[PDB]
Coordinates of C-alpha atoms and ligand atoms in Angstrom, one line a residue:
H1 CA 0.4 -0.1 0.1
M2 CA 3.2 2.2 1.0
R3 CA 3.8 1.8 -2.7
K4 CA 1.3 3.6 -4.5
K5 CA 1.6 6.6 -2.2
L6 CA 5.3 7.1 -3.8
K7 CA 5.8 10.2 -5.0
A8 CA 9.8 10.5 -4.8
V9 CA 12.8 8.5 -4.9
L10 CA 15.9 10.3 -2.9
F11 CA 19.0 9.2 -3.7
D12 CA 22.4 9.5 -2.5
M13 CA 25.3 10.2 -4.7
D14 CA 28.3 8.7 -4.0
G15 CA 28.7 4.9 -3.9
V16 CA 25.0 5.3 -5.2
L17 CA 24.8 6.9 -8.6
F18 CA 28.8 7.2 -8.8
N19 CA 31.6 4.8 -8.0
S20 CA 33.1 7.7 -6.3
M21 CA 33.8 6.0 -3.3
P22 CA 37.3 4.6 -3.6
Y23 CA 39.0 8.0 -4.5
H24 CA 36.9 9.9 -2.0
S25 CA 38.4 7.2 1.1
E26 CA 41.9 7.5 -1.1
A27 CA 41.7 11.3 -1.3
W28 CA 40.7 11.4 2.7
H29 CA 43.6 9.0 3.5
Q30 CA 46.2 10.9 2.1
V31 CA 45.4 14.4 2.4
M32 CA 44.9 13.8 6.8
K33 CA 48.5 12.1 5.9
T34 CA 49.9 15.1 4.7
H35 CA 48.6 17.2 7.5
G36 CA 49.6 14.8 9.9
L37 CA 46.7 13.1 10.8
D38 CA 46.2 9.2 10.6
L39 CA 42.5 8.3 8.8
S40 CA 42.8 5.1 7.8
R41 CA 40.5 4.5 4.3
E42 CA 38.5 1.9 6.6
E43 CA 37.5 4.8 8.7
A44 CA 37.2 7.1 5.8
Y45 CA 34.0 4.7 4.7
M46 CA 32.8 5.0 7.9
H47 CA 32.6 8.8 7.7
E48 CA 30.8 8.3 4.0
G49 CA 27.4 11.0 4.0
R50 CA 29.2 13.5 6.1
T51 CA 30.1 17.2 4.7
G52 CA 33.6 18.0 4.1
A53 CA 33.7 20.1 7.0
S54 CA 32.0 17.4 9.5
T55 CA 34.1 14.9 8.3
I56 CA 37.5 17.1 8.8
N57 CA 36.5 18.1 12.4
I58 CA 35.6 15.0 13.2
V59 CA 39.1 13.7 12.6
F60 CA 40.5 16.3 14.5
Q61 CA 38.7 15.7 17.7
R62 CA 39.0 11.7 17.3
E63 CA 43.2 12.5 16.4
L64 CA 44.2 15.2 18.1
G65 CA 41.5 15.7 20.9
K66 CA 40.4 19.3 19.5
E67 CA 38.2 21.4 16.9
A68 CA 39.7 21.6 13.5
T69 CA 40.2 25.8 12.7
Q70 CA 38.1 27.1 10.0
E71 CA 41.4 27.9 7.8
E72 CA 42.6 24.3 8.5
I73 CA 38.8 23.1 7.0
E74 CA 39.4 25.3 4.0
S75 CA 42.3 24.1 3.1
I76 CA 42.5 20.3 3.7
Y77 CA 39.1 20.5 1.8
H78 CA 40.8 22.2 -1.2
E79 CA 43.4 19.6 -1.1
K80 CA 41.3 16.8 -0.9
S81 CA 39.2 18.2 -4.1
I82 CA 42.7 18.6 -5.8
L83 CA 43.4 14.8 -4.6
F84 CA 40.0 13.6 -5.8
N85 CA 39.8 15.1 -9.1
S86 CA 43.3 14.2 -10.2
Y87 CA 42.3 10.4 -10.3
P88 CA 40.3 9.3 -13.5
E89 CA 36.9 10.7 -13.2
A90 CA 34.5 8.5 -11.2
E91 CA 32.2 6.4 -13.5
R92 CA 28.5 5.4 -13.1
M93 CA 27.4 2.5 -10.6
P94 CA 26.4 -0.3 -12.8
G95 CA 22.4 0.0 -12.6
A96 CA 21.8 3.6 -11.5
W97 CA 20.8 5.0 -14.6
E98 CA 18.7 1.3 -15.2
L99 CA 16.9 1.8 -11.8
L100 CA 16.7 5.5 -12.5
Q101 CA 14.8 5.0 -16.0
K102 CA 12.2 2.6 -13.7
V103 CA 11.8 5.3 -11.3
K104 CA 11.0 7.6 -13.9
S105 CA 8.7 5.2 -15.8
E106 CA 6.7 4.5 -12.6
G107 CA 5.8 8.4 -12.9
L108 CA 8.1 9.0 -9.5
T109 CA 10.4 11.9 -8.6
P110 CA 14.3 11.4 -8.7
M111 CA 16.3 13.5 -6.2
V112 CA 19.8 13.8 -5.0
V113 CA 20.3 14.0 -1.3
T114 CA 24.1 14.1 -1.1
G115 CA 26.8 15.5 1.9
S116 CA 29.2 16.2 -1.4
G117 CA 30.6 19.4 -2.5
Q118 CA 32.4 18.3 -5.3
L119 CA 31.0 20.3 -8.1
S120 CA 33.1 17.9 -10.7
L121 CA 30.6 15.2 -9.7
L122 CA 27.7 17.7 -8.8
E123 CA 27.9 18.8 -12.5
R124 CA 28.4 15.3 -14.0
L125 CA 24.2 14.3 -12.8
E126 CA 23.3 15.4 -15.8
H127 CA 25.6 14.2 -18.4
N128 CA 25.6 10.7 -16.8
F129 CA 21.6 10.7 -16.0
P130 CA 20.1 13.1 -18.7
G131 CA 16.4 14.6 -18.1
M132 CA 16.8 12.5 -14.3
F133 CA 17.4 15.2 -11.8
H134 CA 17.3 19.1 -11.2
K135 CA 19.0 21.9 -9.1
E136 CA 15.9 22.8 -6.7
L137 CA 15.1 18.9 -6.6
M138 CA 18.6 18.4 -4.9
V139 CA 20.4 18.7 -1.5
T140 CA 24.2 19.3 -1.4
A141 CA 26.8 20.5 0.9
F142 CA 25.8 23.7 0.3
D143 CA 22.4 23.6 1.7
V144 CA 22.7 22.3 4.6
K145 CA 24.5 23.4 8.3
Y146 CA 25.2 20.0 9.8
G147 CA 24.6 17.2 7.5
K148 CA 24.1 13.8 7.7
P149 CA 23.8 12.0 9.7
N150 CA 21.2 14.5 11.1
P151 CA 17.9 14.2 9.8
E152 CA 18.4 17.6 8.0
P153 CA 19.2 17.0 4.7
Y154 CA 16.9 14.7 4.1
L155 CA 14.2 17.1 5.8
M156 CA 15.1 19.8 3.7
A157 CA 14.7 17.2 0.3
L158 CA 11.0 16.7 1.0
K159 CA 10.5 20.3 1.9
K160 CA 11.8 21.2 -1.6
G161 CA 9.7 18.6 -3.1
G162 CA 6.7 19.5 -1.2
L163 CA 6.2 16.1 -0.3
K164 CA 5.2 14.0 3.1
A165 CA 7.7 11.3 4.4
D166 CA 5.4 8.4 3.5
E167 CA 5.7 10.0 0.1
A168 CA 9.4 9.1 -0.4
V169 CA 11.5 6.0 -0.6
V170 CA 15.7 7.2 -0.2
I171 CA 18.3 4.7 -1.6
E172 CA 21.5 5.5 0.5
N173 CA 24.6 3.1 0.9
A174 CA 26.7 4.2 4.1
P175 CA 25.6 3.9 7.7
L176 CA 25.8 7.5 8.0
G177 CA 23.2 8.3 5.3
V178 CA 20.7 5.7 6.0
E179 CA 20.4 7.3 9.9
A180 CA 19.6 10.4 8.5
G181 CA 17.2 9.2 6.1
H182 CA 15.6 6.8 8.9
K183 CA 15.4 9.9 11.5
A184 CA 13.5 11.7 8.8
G185 CA 11.1 9.1 9.4
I186 CA 11.5 8.3 5.4
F187 CA 11.7 4.5 4.3
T188 CA 15.3 4.1 3.9
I189 CA 16.6 0.9 1.5
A190 CA 20.1 0.4 1.7
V191 CA 22.6 -1.1 -0.9
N192 CA 26.0 -2.4 0.3
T193 CA 28.3 -0.7 -2.4
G194 CA 31.4 -0.5 0.3
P195 CA 33.3 -3.0 1.7
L196 CA 31.4 -3.3 5.0
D197 CA 29.1 -5.8 6.3
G198 CA 25.5 -5.3 5.3
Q199 CA 24.6 -5.8 9.0
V200 CA 25.9 -2.3 9.6
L201 CA 23.3 -0.5 7.6
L202 CA 20.7 -2.4 9.2
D203 CA 21.6 -1.3 12.6
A204 CA 21.7 2.1 11.2
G205 CA 18.0 1.8 10.4
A206 CA 17.7 0.7 6.8
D207 CA 14.3 -0.9 5.8
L208 CA 15.2 -3.4 3.5
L209 CA 19.0 -4.4 2.1
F210 CA 20.2 -5.2 -1.0
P211 CA 23.9 -6.1 -2.5
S212 CA 24.1 -4.0 -5.2
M213 CA 22.4 -1.5 -7.6
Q214 CA 21.9 -3.7 -9.8
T215 CA 20.2 -6.0 -7.7
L216 CA 18.2 -3.7 -6.3
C217 CA 17.2 -2.6 -9.6
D218 CA 16.1 -5.8 -10.7
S219 CA 13.7 -6.2 -7.4
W220 CA 12.1 -3.1 -8.2
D221 CA 8.8 -4.3 -8.8
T222 CA 8.8 -6.8 -6.1
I223 CA 9.4 -3.7 -3.3
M224 CA 6.2 -2.9 -1.1
Ligands
MG303 MG1 27.2 7.6 -0.1

């Protein structure tokens, strides 16, 4: 019955639309090294979904026992962007385009809800997923004060789309993201695209779990 109440599907970008997480984790790891801090690739994955600013500050708290200054945030963030974009551009997660076609064909509105401030990725959405997304139906780092795992971004999305929590579904791949969608009170589907135990996504409050975007796409008509 939830099924025909649906009006919008809310996608995270990294690890859901683009296969960028290998790169994000590498870039975080490396830029932290340069600044003289230990952030493993694995921990970088655990931070997926946060804004850059929130990530940097938390790493500073866990490692040095203090806040990062505003200048430290901008400086590390700029460098992280350089490192990220110095890799061959991230490609589409297999299945993402085909699922978006299924979503659109069912008359549903695609939205992006992301902690990303990476303009290279944000501006590539249209080129990769043509006709799917619009700026006014997106939430990015630029919109939020807190970001995931706070529900704030997902609540902003509902409002931007003029939706009620029961008129939406969230597609997330990372625990902080699942958590934010869940706390926004939205039915949340986890897709385990990363190197994580699918359990951690269930623990974060995911209503359904899939191993890949392809599997999710294949089972889209089964979902209720
Ligand atoms: Mg993600």
